[PDB]
Design a protein around this ligand. Structure first.
Ligand SMILES: Cc1cn([C@H]2C[C@H](O)[C@@H](COP(=O)(O)OP(=O)(O)O)O2)c(=O)[nH]c1=O
Ligand SMILES: *[C@@H]1O[C@H](CO)[C@@H](O)[C@H](O)[C@H]1O[C@H]1C[C@](C)(N)[C@H](O)[C@H](C)O1
Lengths: 384, 7, 382
């Protein structure tokens, strides 16, 4: 079949869509995408028909003083822009999957309505579930949503046939939005039972490890991974620095992460290997533990890998899920102390913890995109 | 606000 | 991570460099360029910061009678010029990537040597790697070079505290040059297993075609592209006339690129169209086939565009298209209307149109990313 996958937002909530799409294709389904301009390169290196829409998300890829698509001063432009370019793309489609910017979501749901096809909205964590919010909170969302782009929405719905809608938050998120997160790391709460959880949507990584790294890994004792993301935030660098130290203090080698914008590293004892755009799927399965920030993406990769992990919590969700599962330790504060990171590491490197991380991994799913696909297929097969 | 993000 | 990218050469030796620079800046790294005056507008357009160095490469870009940057005459001025303007650009960089004019490539590698940052030289065709050269002619190159600018080089080398070097050919190209070309089109030969082939460095173009060009494409049948890029030899204008005829003899419309030859349509006929700068990636996605010169860049853009092609011989890519079975080579510089019509007939055959759009997907589009990650790994290790 042909499925349209739209979305407007950052790389964190957009990459999943590219993964569902690429998967739907592997299953012989003409899946096309509607994303902000700054994703063409990506859809290129993965091979997914993608038609650009609206301003670019990444400030850089954007004109001099051109506001971002989330800017209040351009909600209306956003509504119109989408309502305009989406019709071409949603041409021969029997299903639509969306995530991100509500305005663009409401816009897309309408083409789905006009065309009478099924529409699915997805969120990446249970926190973002409408059902996990208070009835009042849901009212602020709908009120503010309506008060912000409501008129613009109903004007284009009218300007094309559909009747006026109210409660744009409920309208865009759907009664029961899909949750593309892993059930073990992001389990549903007792209030979200009527929700459908497919599993995390991650793109497979085939890339091999460079010969140098292969050389490093082979050349000695299993190293520890330290990676805190692409944050250039001063604290992030201190945490990284403090982690290198906790790892050395434990007589262990390191595989450290660095961004494209960081300054070159002065020197590295032959026990530290700097790594950039590496395949984390394959690498995590080559290390003893991972010290990293509070991020679902890295946390899951590590959990699938079955390696103990140390998570430095923000200002704390995943950090704590790691301890709840008894698979890692949530050290905390922007910059934890050498003692703090050292006691955590001592726990992480404990055989019993490694065994627990191993047991856990045996319970993690890797078929979210396929489960998603099977749901879409059944959708078309009963609604179209 | 009322639109989402994440920028 | 600042990376300095440089070179002196036709548009085909530059566009790929401008792609690596744009990609690096897109990834978060920074880039700076040292290119001949010809590409200032082009760089401004892509948003890559560039320092103009030396004479212009395009003939019609320099004063009349003025020598080009490759002419053995100027060599010492070239060497001198690069050793003079590169420091302002290279200061603060962590690596450098070059291609093009050897005397300029050596000046850069020297200044990189003084700063202690990795250097990499790239070739766009496998048949240019020093490993597809008899280690006989390779000796001629070193001797030739060492004699031409050699002394001048070591002179400036001296002025900044550097020990002299010999074999300027192995220095400029290094013991393991990079091959920024796609595997399916420009495959390495078993005489160079070692070398690194990153896949062509292409810059995803988003520029729209003009309004008139759109009007044309709309007001009629789908055209055949005719253009020879940086070719500026006399034959070029003749070769263009023979191709226009061959396409008209076929009864198809055409889009002609002025190129560095400043070719003009033979008449005010309404079935043709002349363009200057243009998004070839876009245009190539809107023509039936392309008749062009033998060049790494255009052959690949057409090949990834999924169109049949006719390549005009010199007297590598010509044949590559033939073997891959996506087009036809024809002898030149000025081909006969017959061969061209025979080709335009084979090429537009249901057989070729098929293999053409098939070989299009076997084309890697992660070329600049692979080079980028190779530069990251270099900067760390070294
Ligand atoms: C003429 C022209 C070329 N190009 C670019 C795309 C090609 O990859 C690049 C180099 O072409 P190429 O044929 O490889 O080199 P040369 O013309 O010097 O022999 O030029 C444009 O983007 N627009 C244009 O209008
Ligand atoms: C964003 O809105 C949804 C709407 O339904 C809520 O369910 C979700 O909790 C909310 O996200 C939170 C947490 C987050 C993403 N960290 C941000 O701080 C936003 C503003 O609030």
């Amino acid at each position: 079949m042909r499925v349209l996958i739209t979305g407007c937002g950052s790389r964190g909530d957009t990459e999943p869509l590219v993964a569902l799409a690429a998967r739907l294709r592997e299953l012989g389904a003409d899946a096309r995408m509607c994303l902000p301009p700054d994703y063409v390169e990506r859809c290129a290196e993965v091979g997914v028909p993608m038609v650009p829409v609206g301003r670019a998300v990444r400030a850089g890829a954007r004109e001099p003083g051109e506001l971002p698509p989330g800017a209040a001063e351009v909600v209306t432009e956003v509504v119109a822009e989408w309502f305009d370019k989406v019709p071409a793309a949603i041409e021969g489609c029997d299903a639509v999957v969306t995530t991100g910017l509500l305005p663009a979501a409401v816009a897309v749901r309408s083409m789905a309505e006009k065309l009478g096809i099924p529409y699915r909205y997805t969120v990446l964590s249970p926190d973002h579930l409408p059902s996990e919010q208070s009835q009042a909170e849901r009212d602020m969302y709908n009120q503010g949503a309506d008060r912000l782009f409501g008129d613009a929405v109903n004007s284009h719905r009218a300007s094309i046939g559909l009747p006026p809608v109210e409660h744009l938050y409920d309208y865009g998120y759907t009664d029961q939005p899909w949750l593309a997160a892993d059930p073990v790391l992001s389990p549903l709460r007792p209030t979200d039972l009527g929700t459908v959880q497919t599993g995390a949507w991650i793109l497979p990584d085939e890339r091999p490890l460079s010969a140098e790294l292969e050389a490093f890994l082979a050349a000695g004792s299993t190293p520890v991974y330290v990676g805190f993301g692409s944050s250039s935030r001063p604290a992030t660098a201190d945490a990284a620095k403090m982690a290198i130290k906790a790892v050395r203090a434990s007589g262990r080698r390191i595989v450290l992460s660095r961004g494209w914008a960081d300054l070159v590293l002065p020197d590295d004892g032959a026990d530290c290997f700097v790594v950039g755009e590496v395949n984390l799927q394959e690498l995590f399965g080559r290390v003893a533990a991972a010290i990293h920030h509070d991020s679902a993406g890295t946390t899951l990769l590590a959990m699938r890998a079955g390696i103990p992990q140390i998570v430095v919590r923000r200002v704390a969700y995943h950090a704590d899920r790691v301890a709840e599962l008894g698979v890692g330790v949530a050290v905390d504060g922007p910059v934890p102390t050498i003692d703090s990171l050292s006691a955590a590491l001592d726990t992480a490197l404990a055989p019993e913890i490694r065994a627990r991380a191993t047991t856990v991994a045996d319970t993690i799913r890797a078929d979210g995109t396929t489960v998603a696909a099977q749901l879409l297929f059944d959708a078309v097969s009963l609604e179209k | 606000x009322x639109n989402x993000x994440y920028x």
